[PDB]
C-alpha cells in the first residue's frame, strides 16, 4: 500500500478503488470494537504511512531546494500540498486527512523556515504580490512562521511611509503629508487584503508602521504631525476658491 | 389666487389654499402636462418649459417625468452630436462637442429652468452615457480620445497654442473628464503619453504639465495623480541630478573625461510606465561604457540603496558621420548607434557580426536595420533588402541629407497599438486587484453574504474608478479560490465562505 | 570614424535593499566597510561599529559618517539621520 501510494505520488495513477478498499478494511474490520475503533488502523497503516510520507517529503523538499529558487519552491510546495490533500482523500480514512497533511507541511515549509524566512525580505520589499501570497499561505500553517513575515512587512511599510512623507513642499505640506500617508495606507491595505488575506496580524503591522511614521520626530524637534493635521482641517474647511464642493469635503 | 388669499384670509391658510389650487389644476390633470412635457423639452420651447417646471415643481410627482424627459433629450442630443466625427481631428472635436452640449444645456437649465439640483444631475447622468458610448461589440473610445486630446494640446506644436488658451482649455476639459467613468484607462493612457512628452522634450512647458496634473488631482485625488506627479518630479529633478553628476566628475582625484556628453534622465521604477520587458541583452558600445560606469559609480555613491535599470530603447544620443563626408549630425537611439559604431569598424558588416557585437535580439536588430535603411543611411548588398542568415549590410556613402542636423529616430509617436493592448491588459489587471481587495474586505468583515448584495456593493464602491463587470468579479472570485482565501457556503451556493 | 557628441540617456532607479547589508558600500553589515577593505588587519577590525538610526537602518559607522560629511539625510528613506545604537 505504501509503495503504491508512493507510485501515485511519483506520477502514475494506480487503482484508487483497490487501495481505498484495502485501507478501509483496516478500519471496517474493527467496527464492533467500540473501544478505540481506529487503533488497528492507526497502528498497522497510519503510523507507517506517516513515517513514509515524512521521509518522502523530506527528500522531496531537499530535491526541490537544490534546483529551484524560493519563488518557485513555494509554488511547488503548494502544488504538492494540494496534490497530497487530494490523494489523501481518495486513499485514506477521514480521520487521517489532517495528520498526513500536517506531515506534508512540517517537512517542506516548517523544516525550511530558515530558507523561507530569509526570503521574506526580497519578497515583501519588492512587492512580489504572487510570491508574497504563496509564502503567506505557506507560513500560515506553521505556528512560528508569520511573526517574521509580519515584521518584514512592518519594516517595509515604515520605510515606504518615511520615503513618502519626506522632503514635502512647505507650500502645501499639511495636505501633502495627509495624502501621502493616505496613499501608503491605501496601497498597503489593498496589498494586505488581496495578497495576505487581510489578517489582523498584517493590518496590525500596518497600523504600527503608520503610527511610527506619522509620529516621526525630527532631530531635536517636536512632532509636527498634530500641527499639520490641524492645518489640513483648517485649510480644508475654510471657504477656499478651489472648488471643494461639500460632498467632496465630507 | 395668491393675491386674493393674501387679502381675504389669515397667513396660516396661505399655503393650504395654494396647495388646493395646485392639486386641482396641475395634479389632477397630470397626464395632460406629462403628455406635452416631452414635446416642449425635445423641441426646447423656453417659456413653456419654464412654466411647466414652475407648475410641476410644487406637485409631488411632477418633476421626475420632466427630469427623465430632459435627461432623454440631452442623451439624444449628445449622441447625435458625437456620432459622425472626422478621424483627422476626432480627439479635439469629441471633447469640444461634449463641451458645447454641456454648456448649452447648463445654460438652458440655469436660465429658463430656475437651475435645479435634480435637472443638472439629470444633465450629468445623460452626459455620462453620452461620453461613455460603448459601441456594440467595441470598447469605450472615450478615455483614449480624452488622453489623446490632452496629449495633442500639451505637446509642442507649430499650430499655435498660447499658454492662457491651453490653461482655459484644460480647465474646461475637466467638465468632460469627470464624466468619463473609465479613469483607470485614462490614467494609464495619460501616463503613457506623459512619459513620452517628458522624456523626449515634447512638452511645451512643464508648468502646463504641473497644472494639468494638479487639475486631475483636484478632479480625483492624490491617488489618481500619485504616479503622474512622481513622473513630473523625476524630470524636474533630473537637471539638478545632472548638475550633481558634473560636479562629481569635476571633483575627482584624476581627470574623468567622459568624452562626449551626458544628459541622464534617471526615473523612478514604480512610478513610470516604462519597463525592461523588451530586453535584448544590449551591449553598450565602448564610447558609452565609460560614461555608464562613471554614472553607476556616482549613483552608488550619492544615492545609496538604488539600482539602475538602464533603458536603452529610450536613450537618444547624437552621432557625427564625419566618415561619410559629414552632411549633418544624426539624433539616433542607442540601438542604432551600436550598429552604426559597428559600421565604424569596416564598410561591410553581416547580421551575425551585429549579433556578435551588439548582442541584440533578432527583432530589435531587424527593426534598427529597417529604420536605418528607410532613411537610406546604409544600403544592403543583397537584392532582398530584408534580413537573412548572412545579409551582408554595406555603407551607403551616396546618401546626404538636406539639413545640417537631421533626426533619424521616430519614437515620439505611432502609439504602438500593441502597447495599447498592453495598457488595457494592465488596466484589467489593476481592476482585478481592486476587485479582489473589495471582495476580501467584504467577506472578512461580514463572513456571510450572497451574490446580489456583494455585486451591488462592488459596483457602488468601484464606480469612482471604473465600471466593473460580472465576469471580472467572477474571475477574481476564482483567483481567490485558487489562493484559498474564499469558498462558498454548503447550505447555499448563493452564500460564500471564508478561510 | 563616427564621433558621438551626445548620449541623452534614460535609466530606471529601483530600491535595491538586500537583507543584512550596508547600503552605502553594498557590503555586509558585520563585515568591514569598503573603506576598511584596505589595511584589513592593521587596525582592531572592531572600529567598524554598526550604526543604527532612529529609522531602524543599519549602516557602518565609517560609511554613515562619510555620508553625513556631505548629506545629513539617511540614504534609504531621505529622512534626517539620528544615531540611536552602536
Ligand atoms: Zn558600509
Ligand atoms: Zn571601516
Ligand atoms: Zn533611514
PDB file of N, CA, C and O in Angstrom, chain B residues 27-88:
ATOM      1  N   UNK B  27     -52.366  68.768 -10.645  1.00  0.00           N
ATOM      2  CA  UNK B  27     -52.096  67.430 -10.130  1.00  0.00           C
ATOM      3  C   UNK B  27     -53.199  66.467 -10.540  1.00  0.00           C
ATOM      4  O   UNK B  27     -52.960  65.264 -10.683  1.00  0.00           O
ATOM      5  N   UNK B  28     -54.417  66.980 -10.708  1.00  0.00           N
ATOM      6  CA  UNK B  28     -55.484  66.165 -11.276  1.00  0.00           C
ATOM      7  C   UNK B  28     -55.242  65.922 -12.760  1.00  0.00           C
ATOM      8  O   UNK B  28     -55.353  64.790 -13.243  1.00  0.00           O
ATOM      9  N   UNK B  29     -54.907  66.977 -13.495  1.00  0.00           N
ATOM     10  CA  UNK B  29     -54.554  66.866 -14.909  1.00  0.00           C
ATOM     11  C   UNK B  29     -53.052  66.700 -15.087  1.00  0.00           C
ATOM     12  O   UNK B  29     -52.408  67.438 -15.827  1.00  0.00           O
ATOM     13  N   UNK B  30     -52.479  65.718 -14.391  1.00  0.00           N
ATOM     14  CA  UNK B  30     -51.048  65.471 -14.514  1.00  0.00           C
ATOM     15  C   UNK B  30     -50.703  64.852 -15.860  1.00  0.00           C
ATOM     16  O   UNK B  30     -49.629  65.123 -16.409  1.00  0.00           O
ATOM     17  N   UNK B  31     -51.598  64.028 -16.409  1.00  0.00           N
ATOM     18  CA  UNK B  31     -51.330  63.394 -17.695  1.00  0.00           C
ATOM     19  C   UNK B  31     -51.331  64.403 -18.832  1.00  0.00           C
ATOM     20  O   UNK B  31     -50.560  64.256 -19.786  1.00  0.00           O
ATOM     21  N   UNK B  32     -52.174  65.434 -18.750  1.00  0.00           N
ATOM     22  CA  UNK B  32     -52.201  66.445 -19.801  1.00  0.00           C
ATOM     23  C   UNK B  32     -50.895  67.223 -19.867  1.00  0.00           C
ATOM     24  O   UNK B  32     -50.489  67.662 -20.948  1.00  0.00           O
ATOM     25  N   UNK B  33     -50.230  67.420 -18.728  1.00  0.00           N
ATOM     26  CA  UNK B  33     -48.939  68.095 -18.743  1.00  0.00           C
ATOM     27  C   UNK B  33     -47.798  67.141 -19.060  1.00  0.00           C
ATOM     28  O   UNK B  33     -46.825  67.543 -19.705  1.00  0.00           O
ATOM     29  N   UNK B  34     -47.890  65.890 -18.610  1.00  0.00           N
ATOM     30  CA  UNK B  34     -46.840  64.923 -18.894  1.00  0.00           C
ATOM     31  C   UNK B  34     -46.872  64.434 -20.336  1.00  0.00           C
ATOM     32  O   UNK B  34     -45.888  63.850 -20.800  1.00  0.00           O
ATOM     33  N   UNK B  35     -47.978  64.642 -21.047  1.00  0.00           N
ATOM     34  CA  UNK B  35     -48.018  64.329 -22.468  1.00  0.00           C
ATOM     35  C   UNK B  35     -47.457  65.446 -23.335  1.00  0.00           C
ATOM     36  O   UNK B  35     -47.185  65.210 -24.517  1.00  0.00           O
ATOM     37  N   UNK B  36     -47.277  66.648 -22.787  1.00  0.00           N
ATOM     38  CA  UNK B  36     -46.713  67.764 -23.532  1.00  0.00           C
ATOM     39  C   UNK B  36     -45.341  68.187 -23.031  1.00  0.00           C
ATOM     40  O   UNK B  36     -44.678  68.994 -23.695  1.00  0.00           O
ATOM     41  N   UNK B  37     -44.907  67.675 -21.875  1.00  0.00           N
ATOM     42  CA  UNK B  37     -43.546  67.934 -21.418  1.00  0.00           C
ATOM     43  C   UNK B  37     -42.529  67.388 -22.406  1.00  0.00           C
ATOM     44  O   UNK B  37     -41.511  68.032 -22.678  1.00  0.00           O
ATOM     45  N   UNK B  38     -42.795  66.200 -22.958  1.00  0.00           N
ATOM     46  CA  UNK B  38     -41.900  65.628 -23.957  1.00  0.00           C
ATOM     47  C   UNK B  38     -41.775  66.538 -25.171  1.00  0.00           C
ATOM     48  O   UNK B  38     -40.670  66.773 -25.665  1.00  0.00           O
ATOM     49  N   UNK B  39     -42.897  67.068 -25.659  1.00  0.00           N
ATOM     50  CA  UNK B  39     -42.849  67.964 -26.810  1.00  0.00           C
ATOM     51  C   UNK B  39     -42.077  69.237 -26.489  1.00  0.00           C
ATOM     52  O   UNK B  39     -41.180  69.638 -27.240  1.00  0.00           O
ATOM     53  N   UNK B  40     -42.402  69.883 -25.365  1.00  0.00           N
ATOM     54  CA  UNK B  40     -41.772  71.162 -25.058  1.00  0.00           C
ATOM     55  C   UNK B  40     -40.307  71.001 -24.676  1.00  0.00           C
ATOM     56  O   UNK B  40     -39.552  71.977 -24.731  1.00  0.00           O
ATOM     57  N   UNK B  41     -39.878  69.802 -24.292  1.00  0.00           N
ATOM     58  CA  UNK B  41     -38.468  69.568 -23.995  1.00  0.00           C
ATOM     59  C   UNK B  41     -37.692  69.189 -25.246  1.00  0.00           C
ATOM     60  O   UNK B  41     -36.660  69.790 -25.552  1.00  0.00           O
ATOM     61  N   UNK B  42     -38.172  68.198 -26.006  1.00  0.00           N
ATOM     62  CA  UNK B  42     -37.469  67.776 -27.211  1.00  0.00           C
ATOM     63  C   UNK B  42     -37.523  68.825 -28.312  1.00  0.00           C
ATOM     64  O   UNK B  42     -36.753  68.732 -29.271  1.00  0.00           O
ATOM     65  N   UNK B  43     -38.414  69.810 -28.205  1.00  0.00           N
ATOM     66  CA  UNK B  43     -38.394  70.957 -29.098  1.00  0.00           C
ATOM     67  C   UNK B  43     -37.747  72.180 -28.464  1.00  0.00           C
ATOM     68  O   UNK B  43     -37.441  73.139 -29.182  1.00  0.00           O
ATOM     69  N   UNK B  44     -37.536  72.162 -27.146  1.00  0.00           N
ATOM     70  CA  UNK B  44     -36.875  73.236 -26.405  1.00  0.00           C
ATOM     71  C   UNK B  44     -37.599  74.572 -26.583  1.00  0.00           C
ATOM     72  O   UNK B  44     -37.069  75.533 -27.144  1.00  0.00           O
ATOM     73  N   UNK B  45     -38.836  74.610 -26.095  1.00  0.00           N
ATOM     74  CA  UNK B  45     -39.606  75.843 -26.014  1.00  0.00           C
ATOM     75  C   UNK B  45     -39.338  76.484 -24.657  1.00  0.00           C
ATOM     76  O   UNK B  45     -39.627  75.882 -23.621  1.00  0.00           O
ATOM     77  N   UNK B  46     -38.791  77.701 -24.668  1.00  0.00           N
ATOM     78  CA  UNK B  46     -38.279  78.307 -23.440  1.00  0.00           C
ATOM     79  C   UNK B  46     -39.399  78.609 -22.450  1.00  0.00           C
ATOM     80  O   UNK B  46     -39.387  78.122 -21.312  1.00  0.00           O
ATOM     81  N   UNK B  47     -40.368  79.431 -22.865  1.00  0.00           N
ATOM     82  CA  UNK B  47     -41.423  79.860 -21.951  1.00  0.00           C
ATOM     83  C   UNK B  47     -42.262  78.683 -21.475  1.00  0.00           C
ATOM     84  O   UNK B  47     -42.611  78.601 -20.293  1.00  0.00           O
ATOM     85  N   UNK B  48     -42.589  77.758 -22.380  1.00  0.00           N
ATOM     86  CA  UNK B  48     -43.377  76.594 -21.994  1.00  0.00           C
ATOM     87  C   UNK B  48     -42.614  75.700 -21.027  1.00  0.00           C
ATOM     88  O   UNK B  48     -43.198  75.173 -20.075  1.00  0.00           O
ATOM     89  N   UNK B  49     -41.309  75.519 -21.247  1.00  0.00           N
ATOM     90  CA  UNK B  49     -40.516  74.706 -20.330  1.00  0.00           C
ATOM     91  C   UNK B  49     -40.425  75.352 -18.954  1.00  0.00           C
ATOM     92  O   UNK B  49     -40.550  74.666 -17.934  1.00  0.00           O
ATOM     93  N   UNK B  50     -40.217  76.670 -18.908  1.00  0.00           N
ATOM     94  CA  UNK B  50     -40.161  77.361 -17.623  1.00  0.00           C
ATOM     95  C   UNK B  50     -41.492  77.271 -16.887  1.00  0.00           C
ATOM     96  O   UNK B  50     -41.526  76.991 -15.682  1.00  0.00           O
ATOM     97  N   UNK B  51     -42.600  77.495 -17.601  1.00  0.00           N
ATOM     98  CA  UNK B  51     -43.913  77.434 -16.972  1.00  0.00           C
ATOM     99  C   UNK B  51     -44.228  76.031 -16.481  1.00  0.00           C
ATOM    100  O   UNK B  51     -44.769  75.858 -15.384  1.00  0.00           O
ATOM    101  N   UNK B  52     -43.892  75.012 -17.272  1.00  0.00           N
ATOM    102  CA  UNK B  52     -44.152  73.647 -16.837  1.00  0.00           C
ATOM    103  C   UNK B  52     -43.283  73.260 -15.652  1.00  0.00           C
ATOM    104  O   UNK B  52     -43.740  72.521 -14.775  1.00  0.00           O
ATOM    105  N   UNK B  53     -42.038  73.741 -15.598  1.00  0.00           N
ATOM    106  CA  UNK B  53     -41.216  73.490 -14.419  1.00  0.00           C
ATOM    107  C   UNK B  53     -41.823  74.140 -13.185  1.00  0.00           C
ATOM    108  O   UNK B  53     -41.894  73.521 -12.117  1.00  0.00           O
ATOM    109  N   UNK B  54     -42.261  75.396 -13.313  1.00  0.00           N
ATOM    110  CA  UNK B  54     -42.866  76.089 -12.178  1.00  0.00           C
ATOM    111  C   UNK B  54     -44.109  75.347 -11.710  1.00  0.00           C
ATOM    112  O   UNK B  54     -44.341  75.183 -10.507  1.00  0.00           O
ATOM    113  N   UNK B  55     -44.912  74.862 -12.657  1.00  0.00           N
ATOM    114  CA  UNK B  55     -46.136  74.153 -12.310  1.00  0.00           C
ATOM    115  C   UNK B  55     -45.841  72.823 -11.627  1.00  0.00           C
ATOM    116  O   UNK B  55     -46.431  72.504 -10.589  1.00  0.00           O
ATOM    117  N   UNK B  56     -44.927  72.034 -12.190  1.00  0.00           N
ATOM    118  CA  UNK B  56     -44.704  70.677 -11.714  1.00  0.00           C
ATOM    119  C   UNK B  56     -43.743  70.597 -10.536  1.00  0.00           C
ATOM    120  O   UNK B  56     -43.630  69.527  -9.930  1.00  0.00           O
ATOM    121  N   UNK B  57     -43.047  71.685 -10.197  1.00  0.00           N
ATOM    122  CA  UNK B  57     -42.153  71.650  -9.047  1.00  0.00           C
ATOM    123  C   UNK B  57     -42.927  71.472  -7.747  1.00  0.00           C
ATOM    124  O   UNK B  57     -42.507  70.710  -6.867  1.00  0.00           O
ATOM    125  N   UNK B  58     -44.062  72.162  -7.611  1.00  0.00           N
ATOM    126  CA  UNK B  58     -44.814  72.127  -6.363  1.00  0.00           C
ATOM    127  C   UNK B  58     -45.475  70.772  -6.140  1.00  0.00           C
ATOM    128  O   UNK B  58     -45.524  70.280  -5.007  1.00  0.00           O
ATOM    129  N   UNK B  59     -45.997  70.161  -7.204  1.00  0.00           N
ATOM    130  CA  UNK B  59     -46.631  68.855  -7.086  1.00  0.00           C
ATOM    131  C   UNK B  59     -45.578  67.812  -6.742  1.00  0.00           C
ATOM    132  O   UNK B  59     -44.402  67.947  -7.107  1.00  0.00           O
ATOM    133  N   UNK B  60     -45.994  66.770  -6.018  1.00  0.00           N
ATOM    134  CA  UNK B  60     -45.063  65.729  -5.596  1.00  0.00           C
ATOM    135  C   UNK B  60     -44.453  65.016  -6.799  1.00  0.00           C
ATOM    136  O   UNK B  60     -43.249  65.126  -7.060  1.00  0.00           O
ATOM    137  N   UNK B  61     -45.270  64.283  -7.547  1.00  0.00           N
ATOM    138  CA  UNK B  61     -44.791  63.554  -8.723  1.00  0.00           C
ATOM    139  C   UNK B  61     -45.017  64.403  -9.976  1.00  0.00           C
ATOM    140  O   UNK B  61     -45.775  64.069 -10.885  1.00  0.00           O
ATOM    141  N   UNK B  62     -44.382  65.571  -9.985  1.00  0.00           N
ATOM    142  CA  UNK B  62     -44.483  66.465 -11.120  1.00  0.00           C
ATOM    143  C   UNK B  62     -43.198  66.549 -11.913  1.00  0.00           C
ATOM    144  O   UNK B  62     -43.215  66.558 -13.146  1.00  0.00           O
ATOM    145  N   UNK B  63     -42.074  66.598 -11.207  1.00  0.00           N
ATOM    146  CA  UNK B  63     -40.750  66.727 -11.808  1.00  0.00           C
ATOM    147  C   UNK B  63     -40.143  65.442 -12.374  1.00  0.00           C
ATOM    148  O   UNK B  63     -39.522  65.516 -13.441  1.00  0.00           O
ATOM    149  N   UNK B  64     -40.248  64.268 -11.714  1.00  0.00           N
ATOM    150  CA  UNK B  64     -39.483  63.104 -12.205  1.00  0.00           C
ATOM    151  C   UNK B  64     -39.731  62.746 -13.661  1.00  0.00           C
ATOM    152  O   UNK B  64     -38.787  62.359 -14.359  1.00  0.00           O
ATOM    153  N   UNK B  65     -40.965  62.876 -14.151  1.00  0.00           N
ATOM    154  CA  UNK B  65     -41.190  62.673 -15.578  1.00  0.00           C
ATOM    155  C   UNK B  65     -40.512  63.756 -16.404  1.00  0.00           C
ATOM    156  O   UNK B  65     -39.917  63.463 -17.446  1.00  0.00           O
ATOM    157  N   UNK B  66     -40.585  65.011 -15.959  1.00  0.00           N
ATOM    158  CA  UNK B  66     -39.913  66.084 -16.687  1.00  0.00           C
ATOM    159  C   UNK B  66     -38.399  65.934 -16.611  1.00  0.00           C
ATOM    160  O   UNK B  66     -37.694  66.195 -17.593  1.00  0.00           O
ATOM    161  N   UNK B  67     -37.883  65.519 -15.452  1.00  0.00           N
ATOM    162  CA  UNK B  67     -36.451  65.276 -15.310  1.00  0.00           C
ATOM    163  C   UNK B  67     -36.005  64.179 -16.267  1.00  0.00           C
ATOM    164  O   UNK B  67     -34.990  64.311 -16.960  1.00  0.00           O
ATOM    165  N   UNK B  68     -36.766  63.084 -16.326  1.00  0.00           N
ATOM    166  CA  UNK B  68     -36.419  61.985 -17.222  1.00  0.00           C
ATOM    167  C   UNK B  68     -36.516  62.406 -18.682  1.00  0.00           C
ATOM    168  O   UNK B  68     -35.699  61.987 -19.507  1.00  0.00           O
ATOM    169  N   UNK B  69     -37.504  63.233 -19.024  1.00  0.00           N
ATOM    170  CA  UNK B  69     -37.622  63.698 -20.401  1.00  0.00           C
ATOM    171  C   UNK B  69     -36.458  64.601 -20.787  1.00  0.00           C
ATOM    172  O   UNK B  69     -35.932  64.500 -21.901  1.00  0.00           O
ATOM    173  N   UNK B  70     -36.032  65.485 -19.880  1.00  0.00           N
ATOM    174  CA  UNK B  70     -34.870  66.318 -20.174  1.00  0.00           C
ATOM    175  C   UNK B  70     -33.603  65.480 -20.269  1.00  0.00           C
ATOM    176  O   UNK B  70     -32.742  65.743 -21.114  1.00  0.00           O
ATOM    177  N   UNK B  71     -33.472  64.465 -19.411  1.00  0.00           N
ATOM    178  CA  UNK B  71     -32.317  63.577 -19.485  1.00  0.00           C
ATOM    179  C   UNK B  71     -32.286  62.826 -20.808  1.00  0.00           C
ATOM    180  O   UNK B  71     -31.226  62.691 -21.425  1.00  0.00           O
ATOM    181  N   UNK B  72     -33.441  62.338 -21.265  1.00  0.00           N
ATOM    182  CA  UNK B  72     -33.503  61.658 -22.555  1.00  0.00           C
ATOM    183  C   UNK B  72     -33.192  62.610 -23.701  1.00  0.00           C
ATOM    184  O   UNK B  72     -32.524  62.228 -24.668  1.00  0.00           O
ATOM    185  N   UNK B  73     -33.669  63.853 -23.614  1.00  0.00           N
ATOM    186  CA  UNK B  73     -33.354  64.834 -24.645  1.00  0.00           C
ATOM    187  C   UNK B  73     -31.859  65.113 -24.704  1.00  0.00           C
ATOM    188  O   UNK B  73     -31.281  65.194 -25.791  1.00  0.00           O
ATOM    189  N   UNK B  74     -31.217  65.264 -23.543  1.00  0.00           N
ATOM    190  CA  UNK B  74     -29.781  65.522 -23.518  1.00  0.00           C
ATOM    191  C   UNK B  74     -29.011  64.305 -24.016  1.00  0.00           C
ATOM    192  O   UNK B  74     -28.012  64.438 -24.731  1.00  0.00           O
ATOM    193  N   UNK B  75     -29.467  63.105 -23.656  1.00  0.00           N
ATOM    194  CA  UNK B  75     -28.851  61.877 -24.148  1.00  0.00           C
ATOM    195  C   UNK B  75     -28.894  61.815 -25.669  1.00  0.00           C
ATOM    196  O   UNK B  75     -27.875  61.558 -26.319  1.00  0.00           O
ATOM    197  N   UNK B  76     -30.070  62.062 -26.252  1.00  0.00           N
ATOM    198  CA  UNK B  76     -30.203  62.002 -27.703  1.00  0.00           C
ATOM    199  C   UNK B  76     -29.410  63.111 -28.382  1.00  0.00           C
ATOM    200  O   UNK B  76     -28.796  62.884 -29.429  1.00  0.00           O
ATOM    201  N   UNK B  77     -29.403  64.313 -27.801  1.00  0.00           N
ATOM    202  CA  UNK B  77     -28.640  65.412 -28.382  1.00  0.00           C
ATOM    203  C   UNK B  77     -27.145  65.122 -28.358  1.00  0.00           C
ATOM    204  O   UNK B  77     -26.441  65.364 -29.345  1.00  0.00           O
ATOM    205  N   UNK B  78     -26.643  64.588 -27.244  1.00  0.00           N
ATOM    206  CA  UNK B  78     -25.233  64.247 -27.169  1.00  0.00           C
ATOM    207  C   UNK B  78     -24.853  63.121 -28.110  1.00  0.00           C
ATOM    208  O   UNK B  78     -23.800  63.168 -28.750  1.00  0.00           O
ATOM    209  N   UNK B  79     -25.701  62.093 -28.208  1.00  0.00           N
ATOM    210  CA  UNK B  79     -25.419  61.002 -29.133  1.00  0.00           C
ATOM    211  C   UNK B  79     -25.439  61.485 -30.576  1.00  0.00           C
ATOM    212  O   UNK B  79     -24.650  61.020 -31.403  1.00  0.00           O
ATOM    213  N   UNK B  80     -26.344  62.411 -30.900  1.00  0.00           N
ATOM    214  CA  UNK B  80     -26.375  62.975 -32.245  1.00  0.00           C
ATOM    215  C   UNK B  80     -25.138  63.817 -32.519  1.00  0.00           C
ATOM    216  O   UNK B  80     -24.602  63.801 -33.632  1.00  0.00           O
ATOM    217  N   UNK B  81     -24.677  64.572 -31.520  1.00  0.00           N
ATOM    218  CA  UNK B  81     -23.515  65.430 -31.720  1.00  0.00           C
ATOM    219  C   UNK B  81     -22.240  64.609 -31.878  1.00  0.00           C
ATOM    220  O   UNK B  81     -21.441  64.855 -32.789  1.00  0.00           O
ATOM    221  N   UNK B  82     -22.031  63.627 -31.003  1.00  0.00           N
ATOM    222  CA  UNK B  82     -20.838  62.781 -31.063  1.00  0.00           C
ATOM    223  C   UNK B  82     -21.137  61.475 -31.805  1.00  0.00           C
ATOM    224  O   UNK B  82     -20.988  60.373 -31.279  1.00  0.00           O
ATOM    225  N   UNK B  83     -21.575  61.617 -33.059  1.00  0.00           N
ATOM    226  CA  UNK B  83     -21.934  60.465 -33.882  1.00  0.00           C
ATOM    227  C   UNK B  83     -21.042  60.320 -35.107  1.00  0.00           C
ATOM    228  O   UNK B  83     -20.426  59.265 -35.290  1.00  0.00           O
ATOM    229  N   UNK B  84     -20.954  61.341 -35.951  1.00  0.00           N
ATOM    230  CA  UNK B  84     -20.200  61.284 -37.203  1.00  0.00           C
ATOM    231  C   UNK B  84     -19.013  62.250 -37.149  1.00  0.00           C
ATOM    232  O   UNK B  84     -19.066  63.375 -37.647  1.00  0.00           O
ATOM    233  N   UNK B  85     -17.911  61.773 -36.581  1.00  0.00           N
ATOM    234  CA  UNK B  85     -16.745  62.601 -36.318  1.00  0.00           C
ATOM    235  C   UNK B  85     -15.624  62.250 -37.282  1.00  0.00           C
ATOM    236  O   UNK B  85     -15.346  61.071 -37.526  1.00  0.00           O
ATOM    237  N   UNK B  86     -14.986  63.280 -37.830  1.00  0.00           N
ATOM    238  CA  UNK B  86     -13.838  63.074 -38.698  1.00  0.00           C
ATOM    239  C   UNK B  86     -12.667  62.537 -37.885  1.00  0.00           C
ATOM    240  O   UNK B  86     -12.318  63.091 -36.839  1.00  0.00           O
ATOM    241  N   UNK B  87     -12.056  61.455 -38.370  1.00  0.00           N
ATOM    242  CA  UNK B  87     -10.952  60.835 -37.649  1.00  0.00           C
ATOM    243  C   UNK B  87      -9.684  61.675 -37.667  1.00  0.00           C
ATOM    244  O   UNK B  87      -8.762  61.387 -36.896  1.00  0.00           O
ATOM    245  N   UNK B  88      -9.610  62.695 -38.525  1.00  0.00           N
ATOM    246  CA  UNK B  88      -8.430  63.552 -38.558  1.00  0.00           C
ATOM    247  C   UNK B  88      -8.288  64.354 -37.271  1.00  0.00           C
ATOM    248  O   UNK B  88      -7.175  64.526 -36.759  1.00  0.00           O
TER     249      UNK B  88
END
